[PDB]
């Protein structure tokens, strides 16, 4: 039994069967709690859930086929199972908080893609849309360990440590030393010799983060608002080390909308990037062009984080959920629509020992195990 809670925007029923359009307090999803989930993932007005059995369920807005259910217009108000993947045990589903395509990774290392195919982000040597998933053929001989998706590009890394990127090339988000759109997954040659263990991808004029088993954080791509973390605002298409995070023992990285977040093994959260609408959690909406510790969580051991477009959610070791950022749609979960300029404790989840959070564009998930 894994209790699941949802809140935020619900205009396209992306919360999965709740009434109203601004769910401003976390709310028990009867539909998702029943699925017994191991992961939830939030895309643009979309929700995805991976069950313990390996099944994938989606719901929300169906435009651009972003849900993989074979339709590509309308809304799916109750979570429905992605039938194309029933023969495969899905480990993880990757989707950006403002994304219109996703990928799903199976336990046997296979990778599928579906949704908006623009800029070749699906990986199929083409810019076709896929209304249902489709096996990324160019990765078949590679045991894939993790996957990530921005809004215009996608990544995947292998168990041997090599990182692949594909998709929109512009502003160097792929990391290949030019700005050429890649329609196939291509190896980031610069990061060879490092064992890459995570990767995160941004939306719009996108950044990309990478993490090696030595705790080294690489960033590249577009650099507006200093989301590359190395000051100023100059992009680049070659991975560069974010020197500040070195030795800090960073273990999770994520990319919201024009900002970057890292969490350390010691429970510290670092954010930087675009400041507007308090998405960084520093009490002010200025841009932060070199990674800063979120002071509002000093001494609270954050064990999990999730970023949406304009909000973040952090989980303490003791099952508490903090939030910060924008609240036009209740996604802060403080019962109002008032912005959370600093990390604020989330209402109505007392006694629920939350272990994982996930976010979408304007929606939030907390769940247990």
């Amino acid at each position: 039994r894994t209790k699941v809670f949802v809140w935020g925007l619900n205009d396209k029923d992306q919360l999965g069967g709740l009434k109203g359009s601004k769910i401003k307090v976390p709310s028990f999803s009867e539909t998702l709690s029943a699925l017994n989930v191991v992961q939830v993932a939030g895309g643009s007005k979309s929700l995805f859930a991976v069950t313990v059995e390996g099944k994938v369920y989606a719901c929300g807005e169906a435009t651009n086929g972003r849900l993989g259910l074979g339709i590509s217009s309308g809304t799916v108000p109750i979570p429905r199972q992605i039938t194309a993947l029933s023969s495969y045990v899905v480990k993880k589903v990757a989707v950006h908080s403002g994304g219109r395509h996703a990928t799903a990774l199976t336990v046997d290392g296979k990778v599928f893609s579906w949704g908006e195919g623009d800029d070749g982000k699906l990986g199929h040597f083409s810019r076709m849309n896929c209304d249902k998933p489709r096996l990324i053929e160019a990765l078949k001989t590679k045991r894939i360990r993790d996957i990530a998706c921005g809004s215009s590009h996608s990544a995947a890394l292998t168990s041997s440590g090599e990182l692949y990127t594909w998709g929109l090339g512009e502003y160097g988000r792929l990391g290949h030393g030019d700005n050429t759109t890649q329609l196939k997954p291509k190896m980031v040659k610069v990061l060879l010799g490092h064992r890459v263990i995570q990767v995160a991808c941004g939306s719009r004029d996108a950044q990309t983060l990478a993490l090696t088993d030595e705790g080294l954080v690489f960033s590249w791509g577009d650099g507006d608002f200093g989301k590359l973390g190395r000051g100023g605002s100059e992009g680049c298409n070659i991975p560069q080390n974010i020197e500040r995070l070195n030795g800090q023992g960073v273990c999770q990285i994520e990319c919201g909308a024009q900002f970057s977040l890292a969490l350390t093994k010691s429970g510290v959260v670092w954010t930087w990037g675009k400041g507007d609408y308090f998405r960084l959690g520093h009490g002010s909406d200025v841009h932060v062009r070199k990674p800063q510790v979120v002071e509002g969580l000093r001494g609270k051991k954050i064990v999990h984080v999730a970023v949406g477009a304009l909000h973040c959610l952090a989980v303490t070791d003791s099952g508490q959920v903090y939030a910060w950022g924008d609240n036009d749609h209740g996604q802060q979960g403080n019962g109002t629509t008032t912005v959370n300029r600093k990390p604020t404790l989330v209402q109505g989840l007392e006694g629920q020992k939350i272990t994982r959070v996930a976010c979408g564009s304007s929606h939030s998930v907390a769940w247990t195990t």
């Binding site: 359009s21 601004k22 643009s44 007005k45 403002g98 719009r204 477009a309 304009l310 036009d328 304007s362």
Partner: peptide, 9 residues
Amino acid sequence: KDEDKDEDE
């Protein structure tokens, strides 16, 4: 204004 911001119906 801010393009990365969702809207309601």
